[PDB]
Amino acid sequence: AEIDLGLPPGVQVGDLLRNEQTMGSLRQVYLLAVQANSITDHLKRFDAVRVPESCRGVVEAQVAKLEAVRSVIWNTMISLAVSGIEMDENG
Amino acid sequence: VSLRVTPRLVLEVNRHNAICVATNVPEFYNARGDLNIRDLRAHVKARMISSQFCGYVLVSLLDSEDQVDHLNIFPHVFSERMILYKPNNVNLMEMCALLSMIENAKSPSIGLCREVLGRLTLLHSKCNNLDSLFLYNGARTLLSTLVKYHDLEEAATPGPWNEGLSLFKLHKELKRAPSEARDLMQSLFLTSGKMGCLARSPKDYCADLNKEEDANSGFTFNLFYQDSLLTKHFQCQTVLQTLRRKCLGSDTVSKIIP
Secondary structure, eight states, X not given: OOSOOOOOTTOOHHHHHHHHHHHHHHHHHHHHHHHHHHHHHHHHHHHHHOOOSSTHHHHHHHHHHXXXXXXXXXXXXXXXXXXXXXXXXXX | OXXXXXXXXXXXXXXXXXXXXXXXXXXXBOTTOOBOHHHHHHHHHHHHHOSSEEEEEEEEEEGGGBOSSSBOSOHHHHHHHOEEEXXXXXXXXXXXXXXXXXXXXXXXXXXXXXXXXXXXXXHHHHOOSHHHHHHHHHHHHHHHHHHHHHTOOOOOSOOSOOOOSHHHHHHHHHHSSOHHHHHHHHHHHSOOGGGOOBOSOHHHHHHHHHHHSOSSOOOEEEEEOOOXXXXXXXXXXXXXXXXXXXXXXXXXXSOSOO
């Protein structure tokens, strides 16, 4: 190549930068994952807490907002899953 | 930031008249986690003086290819990555041995981990070499993967580990998610079809892998590994095929990165 890097047998350059592309994309996916999982933990707390009476509408709408954001998150993950499938030659 | 190659699937390979066996290095430590350096080093010396010793079979993986129990790699590339190592050096030999022992450690305590990293840095200080820098970085990386995944550091103040194999963080994070979404997301990000199916129990797959190719060849490959978060790729049939092929013929190298 243009700069010698200590590389073991299998590793050529093209694999090595392809690696960086995929590591970026899945880095985003991981951020989305831990986000969706914090939100789903807050959901667990709401749904477990019980005791709603007349304050129930506020609680139901806060659950509604959480669940809504989380749906958008999971769909974003799907949406770049498919894109990564578009880069590949077999799919 | 992740241009790092890491050695995976490290076993040691023996051949007694074309009858071949790839084994993990046995555990050299007690139930509390005291690393038996004396017996380990005697093992390594013994494997050097031996004549039925061919070397450590190892593979080189990139971070985005290792999905914990599936491989986002093509089979030809995978074959180019897998080598048969027999270094003309005792310390590199023992480093590969510790790599084997980390991958196949049943459930190490962080005490065994810190001892193992310690012995490793001590060996790597003895050998300035691209092979020792390689063996060391990757062995520390396997160590760190094991701690971060199993919560062995939890203490609060950081130890000298790193993030480990990246997709292992993804693997752990998706097991946490609602059962509904977890299944799909595992199917979409960490189940790469490219290396094909998994066999139910490798040992049987190698036994009939012997039945098929044993008229022309007296060659007989057997595999011994301890099941572990770091050895799940011994379930993959293409893996086992490539492994038998590499162990039975090919060549050896005295230097990984000459």
